[PDB]
Enzyme design. Structure first.
Site, short mmCIF file in Angstrom:
data_model
loop_
_atom_site.label_atom_id
_atom_site.label_comp_id
_atom_site.label_asym_id
_atom_site.label_seq_id
_atom_site.Cartn_x
_atom_site.Cartn_y
_atom_site.Cartn_z
CB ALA A 196 -0.60 0.08 1.30
NE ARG A 202 -5.78 9.68 0.47
CZ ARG A 202 -6.98 10.49 1.22
NH1 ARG A 202 -5.75 10.53 3.09
NH2 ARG A 202 -7.68 10.11 1.52
CE1 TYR A 203 -3.43 3.76 -5.59
CE2 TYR A 203 -4.59 1.51 -5.34
CZ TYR A 203 -4.24 2.89 -6.53
OH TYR A 203 -4.49 3.22 -7.40
CG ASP A 255 -4.15 -6.42 -6.45
OD1 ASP A 255 -2.89 -6.67 -6.45
OD2 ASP A 255 -4.37 -6.24 -7.95
CB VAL A 256 -4.64 -2.85 -0.84
CG1 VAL A 256 -3.96 -1.84 -1.91
CG2 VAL A 256 -4.72 -2.71 1.11
CD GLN A 289 -10.71 -10.51 -14.28
OE1 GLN A 289 -12.16 -10.38 -14.55
NE2 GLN A 289 -10.38 -8.97 -14.66
CB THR A 297 -7.39 -9.02 -21.93
OG1 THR A 297 -7.37 -9.43 -20.76
CG2 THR A 297 -8.57 -8.40 -22.85
CD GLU A 327 -4.93 -9.64 -14.79
OE1 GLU A 327 -5.18 -8.95 -15.73
OE2 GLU A 327 -5.19 -9.45 -13.33
O1 LIG Z 1 -8.12 -7.60 -19.35
C1 LIG Z 1 -7.72 -8.11 -17.61
C2 LIG Z 1 -7.86 -6.09 -16.55
O2 LIG Z 1 -9.05 -6.50 -16.74
C3 LIG Z 1 -10.31 -5.63 -15.87
O3 LIG Z 1 -11.60 -5.97 -15.05
C4 LIG Z 1 -12.60 -5.12 -16.60
C5 LIG Z 1 -12.31 -6.42 -17.79
O4 LIG Z 1 -11.49 -6.70 -17.98
C6 LIG Z 1 -13.35 -5.55 -18.81
O5 LIG Z 1 -14.53 -6.37 -19.70
C7 LIG Z 1 -14.55 -5.42 -17.67
O6 LIG Z 1 -15.58 -4.65 -18.98
O7 LIG Z 1 -14.15 -4.49 -16.86
C8 LIG Z 1 -13.16 -4.72 -16.26
C9 LIG Z 1 -13.22 -3.85 -14.42
O8 LIG Z 1 -14.06 -2.61 -15.07
C10 LIG Z 1 -8.71 -5.34 -14.67
O9 LIG Z 1 -9.51 -4.30 -13.46
C11 LIG Z 1 -7.66 -5.31 -14.98
O10 LIG Z 1 -6.89 -5.18 -13.49
C12 LIG Z 1 -7.01 -6.28 -15.27
O11 LIG Z 1 -7.10 -7.83 -14.50
#
Ligand SMILES: OC[C@H]1O[C@@H](O[C@H]2[C@H](O)[C@@H](O)[C@H](O)O[C@@H]2CO)[C@H](O)[C@@H](O)[C@H]1O
Length: 277
Positions: A54, A57-58, A144-145, A166, A178, A236
């Site tokens: 952290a 400001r986090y 992550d914090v 994810q 992605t 990532e």
């Molecule tokens: O794609 C890796 C990236 O993803 C973000 O999350 C997004 C997501 O990918 C997207 O499809 C969606 O529409 O919105 C999400 C966030 O509002 C993460 O925020 C970022 O950390 C990565 O992990």
């Protein structure tokens, strides 16, 4: 010794993926017997580490809610050490910790750029593993914090190397992941390849395995930086490359790291940790 049948029942959740082609469990609510595992690991007297960074400001925005929720929900009944990495120690909140929790705080040098932030975090974790964490814990998570434990996040999540699905992509086809797609990047993954899209906000394993994760990710970030390239999703992307090549021995469902902005689909039975607000 502990067998997968002693605690994991995939048939409780037949509508989701519960086992990988390399026979790793994907842990969903309802598939795990925490009582069996709590008793097994209690007999072994394990300790679990949790690292969180952290900066700025986090600290004020997120660190207190993170620590307060982890104390309440993370590995309850087992010793936990919180490793707190901040840029200013005078600013960090001192939370009351419950039985079997303790902490250590380290002052780190903040970096301006996202590329260098993640680069130095993977390097820092590895250095601490060698200096002390490998001596202090049997399992280590790095988180992550800016997220909050919501319910029990327990010993069902332990393993040699642990990756997180994810939340936005767990149902997607790999062609759409992605991943970093430029062959110039060390995190390059071709279209059509890959098993899952893993989230860098949670990963863990034994200290040995986590040292390998972080050392490989740091090398790839560095290699990209020397070539004047920045992976699409920084650490990532490199983490996803790493877990493609070095398959995790356990994967956590998006119940373990859920973005409530998505909604609450039927797949998501009980949320253990959520993305912050
Ligand atoms: O794609 C890796 C990236 O993803 C973000 O999350 C997004 C997501 O990918 C997207 O499809 C969606 O529409 O919105 C999400 C966030 O509002 C993460 O925020 C970022 O950390 C990565 O992990």
């Amino acid at each position: 010794k502990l067998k997968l049948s002693d605690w994991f029942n995939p048939f409780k959740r037949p509508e989701v993926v519960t086992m990988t082609k390399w026979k790793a469990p994907v842990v969903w609510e309802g598939t795990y017997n925490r009582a069996v595992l709590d008793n097994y690991y209690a007999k072994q007297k394990i300790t679990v580490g949790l690292t969180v960074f952290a900066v700025g400001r986090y600290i004020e925005h997120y660190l207190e809610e993170f620590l307060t929720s982890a104390n309440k929900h993370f590995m309850v009944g087992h010793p936990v050490i919180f490793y707190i990495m901040v840029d200013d120690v005078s600013r960090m909140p001192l939370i009351e910790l419950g039985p079997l929790r303790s902490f250590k705080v380290f002052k780190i040098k903040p970096e301006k750029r996202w590329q260098d932030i993640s680069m130095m975090r993977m390097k820092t974790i590895g250095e601490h593993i060698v200096a002390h964490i490998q001596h202090e814990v049997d399992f280590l998570f790095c988180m992550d914090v800016d997220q909050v434990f919501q319910d029990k996040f327990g010993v069902e999540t332990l393993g040699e190397s642990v990756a997180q699905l994810q939340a936005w992509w767990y149902k997607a086809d790999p062609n759409d992941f992605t991943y970093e797609r430029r062959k110039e990047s060390a995190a390059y993954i071709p279209f059509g390849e890959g098993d899952f899209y893993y989230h860098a906000a949670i990963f863990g394993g034994t200290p040995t395995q986590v040292l390998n994760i972080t050392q490989e990710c740091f090398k790839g970030i560095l290699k990209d930086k020397k070539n004047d390239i920045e992976a699409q999703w920084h650490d990532e992307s490199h983490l996803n490359k790493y877990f493609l090549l070095n398959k995790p021995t356990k994967i956590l469902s998006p119940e373990y790291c859920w973005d409530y902005h998505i909604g609450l689909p039927a797949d998501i039975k009980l949320v253990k940790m959520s993305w912050q607000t």
